[PDB]
Structure 1
Amino acid sequence: EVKNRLDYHISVQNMMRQKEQEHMINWVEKRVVQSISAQQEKETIAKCIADLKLLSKK
């Protein structure tokens, strides 16, 4: 009978972290992303590693 009371509170805090995760995630992922390509040279760091794949994948 004790456990139920406790487990409810545990279950809420887990479920609230998952919801905060989805919502945090949806805002985070929707907010930040832009500088990879607003710096076109952070797609040059892709091109750089890709030229170091070009040469240095083999």
Structure 2
Amino acid sequence: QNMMRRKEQEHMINWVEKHVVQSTIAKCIADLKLLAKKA
């Protein structure tokens, strides 16, 4: 049972970041402003 659990977890992790594989720079500008504050 624990080995099946670990292997299902592994396939889930590579599938979730395959999901990101299939998938807006407002955060980029925000980080820019933050770094500008970092002087």
What interval of TM-score do these two structures reach, taking the shorter chain for normalisation? 0.5 to 0.7
RCO higher in structure (CA 8 A, sep ≥6): 1
Aligned-pair identity in percent equals: 53
Q: TM-score, normalised by structure 2?
A: 0.55
Q: Which runs of 5+ in 1 are unaligned?
A: 1-11, 35-40
The total of aligned residue pairs comes to 38
- TM-score normalised to the size of structure 1? 0.46
Larger Rg: 1
Runs of 4+ residues over 3 Å off in structure 1? none
CA-based RMSD of the aligned residues comes to 1.9
Q: Which runs of 5+ in 2 are unaligned?
A: none
